[PDB]
Curated annotation (Swiss-Prot):
Changing residue 130 to K: Confers relative protection against sporadic Creutzfeldt-Jakob disease (CJD) in the heterozygous state. This is Major prion protein. Glycans are attached at residues 92, 108. One of its GO terms (cellular component) is terminal bouton. The chain holds residues 90 to 231 of 253 of the full protein. It comes from the Eukaryota. It is a lipid-anchor; GPI-anchor. Residues 1-141 are annotated as: Interaction with GRB2, ERI3 and SYN1.
């Protein structure tokens, strides 16, 4: 047609407003879960050796080591605000499932053993960062060519 003129202009559509009904729910339902619900487990690392400095603790840790896990849980970065957020979180959680694995026989871990369990998982949770620590270190040494 003659004349014309851009009196209006289009744009890509926006997300729907939603939030109209049934706000609660979704996801899985039913507490018939023997696991931690919303968690995952990672592969083993080369089993660490704790170095407490006290003769008793470094000695004794290695005696019961077969009862302690050599794998740790993992969590998303969505939680809290720290690069290491997932680390000390998986420390606590890893032991949750592992300490009960013996209680099915009526056995338990003593205070010392349960603390030893909690201690092995500390350097194991941070080794995940160590595996990519070069992405942090080399970043200063050279301009990383992969975009970010």
């Amino acid at each position: 047609g003659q004349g014309g003129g851009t009196h209006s202009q289009w744009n890509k559509p926006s997300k729907p407003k939603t939030n109209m009904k049934h706000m609660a729910g979704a996801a899985a339902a039913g507490a018939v879960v023997g696991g931690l619900g919303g968690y995952m487990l990672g592969s083993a690392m080369s089993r660490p050796i704790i170095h407490f400095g006290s003769d008793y603790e470094d000695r004794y840790y290695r005696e019961n080591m077969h009862r302690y896990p050599n794998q740790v849980y993992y969590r998303p970065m969505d939680e809290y605000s720290n690069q290491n957020n997932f680390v000390h979180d998986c420390v606590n959680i890893t032991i949750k499932q592992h300490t009960v694995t013996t209680t099915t026989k009526g056995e338990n871990f003593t205070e010392t053993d349960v603390k030893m369990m909690e201690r092995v998982v500390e350097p194991m949770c941070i080794t995940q960062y160590e595996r990519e620590s070069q992405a942090y270190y080399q970043r200063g040494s050279s301009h990383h060519h992969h975009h970010h």
